[PDB]
C-alpha cells in the first residue's frame, strides 16, 4: 500500500531501496534512515557489501574560487557491513523483505541530532561543480574490507535530505523598539516594530507594524524596511553571509516631534532574488528548484555546526540611521504526505 525509492548498480545489481528521500528532524532525535539492498552474488569470494552515510559539507566563495581553494569536510561518516556473509528490523524493512526475497539485506542508520539540515548554497551562472552546501549521501560498495579502492562499477549513490518543519507552538512574537538620543543635548527618538508571529511559512506575507515617535525637530527622510538573511558558517572561521532577500524603501516625511504608526508588508520569494550567489536554499536533490533555506532551530543543548540559517527583519530610518532588528524563523509547515523533491509539474 506504499512505495519506496530504488537505485541499481551495473556489475553487482546492488539494488538499494530507501523508504523516503527525506528524513524529518525532531530536535530530540532524527528519524531513522532504514532501507534494504538486493545483493545478487556477482562474485565467488567478495561477499562483503558496505553502506556508508556521509553528511558532506562543501563550501567556496567567489574570491575563494578566484584564488583556487574550496573547503569540504565530512561532518559525519557511518560504515555498516549490511551483509553478514545487530540492527533489528523495522516495519517498512519487513514489508520490503517480504516483497524482495531471501537476498534482501537490511541497513539502518540514525543521524545524531543537531547535525545541520540539508541546505545548499545557490550556485552562480559560472558555478558548475559540485553544489556548495550541506548534502547527505548514502552509498553502497561491493568490495572486501576497505583496502580495495572504491570502484564505480559497484557503488550506488543516493542523495537524502534532513529537514525541519515549523513547530505547533508559535513561540514569542518578535518585537523590538529602540530610542536614540541625538547629539543635540539628549533629545530622544523612538522606533518600534512588531511581527505577526515568530514562524513564517514560505511565501506568507510579513506585516511588520512600525511606529515612530520623533522627539526632535528633524524629519524622517525615508524608511528602508528589509528582510535580511544571515547564513552563518561554522567551519574554517568563515564570515557570516548576510544578504537582503526582500526590501521596501518606503519614503515618508513625518512632522518633527510627532508620532506616526502604520504597517509595511514584505514577502520573501526566490523570483526577485535568483541572482545573489551564495544564498542559502533548502536541499536540492539534483539542481532542482527549491525554496529559500529553512531556518534551522537549535532547540537542543547546542553545538554550532554546518550552515546555520536565520532571517531577521531589519528596519532602518535615515537621519544618520536608526536601525532595529527583529529576528524570526522562516520554515515550512508540517506537510501531510511528503514534498515532491522537485517542481511539482516536471517540465
Amino acid at each position, epitope marked *: 500500500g506504499t512505495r519506496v525509492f530504488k537505485k541499481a548498480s551495473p556489475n553487482g545489481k546492488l539494488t538499494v531501496y530507501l523508504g523516503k528521500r527525506d528524513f524529518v528532524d525532531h530536535i530530540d532525535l532524527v528519524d531513522p534512515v532504514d532501507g534494504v539492498v538486493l545483493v545478487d552474488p556477482e562474485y565467488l569470494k567478495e561477499r562483503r557489501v558496505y553502506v556508508t552515510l556521509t553528511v558532506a559539507f562543501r563550501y567556496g566563495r567567489e574570491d575563494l574560487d578566484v584564488l583556487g581553494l574550496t573547503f569540504r569536510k565530512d561532518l559525519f561518516v557511518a560504515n555498516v557491513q549490511s551483509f553478514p556473509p545487530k540492527k533489528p528490523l523495522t516495519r517498512l524493512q519487513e514489508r520490503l523483505i517480504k516483497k524482495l526475497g531471501e537476498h534482501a539485506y537490511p541497513f539502518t542508520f540514525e543521524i545524531p541530532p543537531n547535525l545541520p539540515s540539508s541546505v545548499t548554497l545557490q550556485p552562480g551562472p559560472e558555478d558548475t561543480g559540485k553544489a556548495l552546501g550541506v548534502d547527505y549521501e548514502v552509498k553502497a560498495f561491493v568490495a572486501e574490507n576497505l583496502e580495495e579502492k572504491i570502484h564505480k562499477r559497484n557503488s550506488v549513490r543516493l542523495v537524502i535530505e534532513k529537514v525541519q518543519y515549523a513547530p505547533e507552538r508559535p513561540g514569542p512574537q518578535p518585537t523590538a523598539e529602540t530610542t536614540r538620543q541625538f547629539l543635540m543635548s539628549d533629545k530622544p527618538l523612538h522606533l518600534e516594530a512588531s511581527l505577526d508571529k515568530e514562524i513564517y511559512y514560505h511565501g506568507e*506575507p510579513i506585516s511588520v507594524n512600525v511606529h515612530v515617535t520623533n522627539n526632535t525637530n528633524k524629519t524622517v527622510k525615508k524608511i528602508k524596511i528589509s528582510v535580511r538573511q544571515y547564513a552563518d558558517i561554522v567551519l574554517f572561521n568563515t564570515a557570516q553571509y548576510k544578504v537582503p532577500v526582500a526590501m521596501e524603501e518606503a519614503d515618508d516625511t513625518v512632522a518633527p516631534s510627532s508620532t506616526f504608526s502604520k504597517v509595511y508588508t514584505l514577502t520573501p520569494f526566490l523570483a526577485n532574488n535568483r541572482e545573489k550567489r551564495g544564498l542559502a536554499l533548502d536541499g536540492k536533490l539534483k539542481h532542482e528548484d527549491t525554496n529559500l533555506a529553512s531556518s534551522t532551530l537549535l532547540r537542543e543543548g547546542r553545538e554550532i555546526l554546518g550552515i546555520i540559517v536565520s532571517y531577521k527583519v531589519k528596519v532602518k530610518l535615515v537621519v544618520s540611521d536608526v536601525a532595529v532588528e527583529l529576528p524570526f524563523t522562516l520554515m515550512h509547515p508540517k506537510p501531510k504526505e511528503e514534498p*515532491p523533491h522537485r517542481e511539482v509539474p516536471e*517540465n
Partner: single-chain antibody
Framework: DIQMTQSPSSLSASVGDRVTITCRAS??????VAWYQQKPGKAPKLLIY???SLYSGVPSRFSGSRSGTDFTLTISSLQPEDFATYYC?????????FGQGTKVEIQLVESGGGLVQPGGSLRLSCAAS????????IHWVRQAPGKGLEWVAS????????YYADSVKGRFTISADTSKNTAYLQMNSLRAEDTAVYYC?????????????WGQGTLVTV
C-alpha cells in the same frame, strides 16, 4: 504531452452502486493524479489528490488506487448528492492534460468577459481573496460548452514562472498583480477558437495539493 484515457467515459446508474472509473496514462506519472466533480452551472471541486490522499471536506466514499499506470476512483454508495461530471487530472509533468470526463445519471472572482467580437483582445481579472499570490499558484482553466476541461494558463509567483499550453504559447499573458492580490489574463485571438467558459483557480503553491479553489467564472462567447 501525456494523454489520459478515461474508460468508461459514461457511467449512469441508480443509488448505492460502487461505481468505478478508471483512468490510464500514456506515460508514467508516478501517483500524481487528481479527480474533480462539477455540476451544471458550477465550478468543479477537488475530491482526490496525489493518488488516494483524500481531500478535506468531502466524504470517505471516494478513493484512489495507483494500479501500475492506471488510476481508479470508486464510489461505494452513489448518494443523490453525487450526480456530477467527473474528471482525471494528472500533474506529474507539463502540461496538466486532463481526462476524458464522465457523467453520472439516474472567494475568487473572475470577471471582464461576455459576448466577444470576432477578433481582438480581452482582459480577464481573477480577484483572489483569502491567500497571497506568493503563497499560492494561480491557474486558469477553460471548458467549451458541453466539453472537457483543459488547462489554459498558470502563474507561480514565488518562483516567478509563467506557463501556457503548447497550443496557446504566446496567445495569452498571465500576470500576478500583488497590489490587489489578483491575477490578470490578456487574450489576443479571434473567432470562436477558444469561446468557452473560463474559471480562475488556486492551488497550494509549494506541494501543489491539486487546484483546491475555483471561481464562478464567466462565458467568453465570441
Amino acid at each position: 504531452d501525456i494523454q489520459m484515457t478515461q474508460s468508461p467515459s459514461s457511467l449512469s446508474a441508480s443509488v448505492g452502486d460502487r461505481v468505478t472509473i478508471t483512468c490510464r496514462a500514456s506515460q508514467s506519472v508516478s501517483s500524481a493524479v487528481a479527480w474533480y466533480q462539477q455540476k451544471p452551472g458550477k465550478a468543479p471541486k477537488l475530491l482526490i489528490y496525489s493518488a488516494s490522499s483524500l481531500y478535506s471536506g468531502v466524504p470517505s466514499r471516494f478513493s484512489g488506487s495507483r494500479s501500475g499506470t492506471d488510476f481508479t476512483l470508486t464510489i461505494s454508495s452513489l448518494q443523490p448528492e453525487d450526480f456530477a461530471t467527473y474528471y482525471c487530472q494528472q500533474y506529474k509533468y507539463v502540461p496538466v492534460t486532463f481526462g476524458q470526463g464522465t457523467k453520472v445519471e439516474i472567494q475568487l472572482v473572475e470577471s471582464g468577459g461576455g459576448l466577444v467580437q470576432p477578433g481582438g483582445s480581452l482582459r480577464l481579472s481573477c480577484a483572489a481573496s483569502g491567500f497571497n499570490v506568493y503563497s499560492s499558484s494561480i491557474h486558469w482553466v477553460r471548458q467549451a460548452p458541453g466539453k472537457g476541461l483543459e488547462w489554459v494558463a498558470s502563474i507561480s509567483s514565488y518562483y516567478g514562472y509563467t506557463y501556457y499550453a503548447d497550443s496557446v504559447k504566446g496567445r495569452f499573458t498571465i500576470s500576478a498583480d500583488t497590489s490587489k492580490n489578483t491575477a490578470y489574463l490578456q487574450m489576443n485571438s479571434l473567432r470562436a477558437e477558444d469561446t468557452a467558459v473560463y474559471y480562475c483557480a488556486r492551488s497550494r503553491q509549494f506541494w501543489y495539493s491539486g487546484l483546491d479553489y475555483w471561481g464562478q467564472g464567466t462565458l467568453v462567447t465570441v
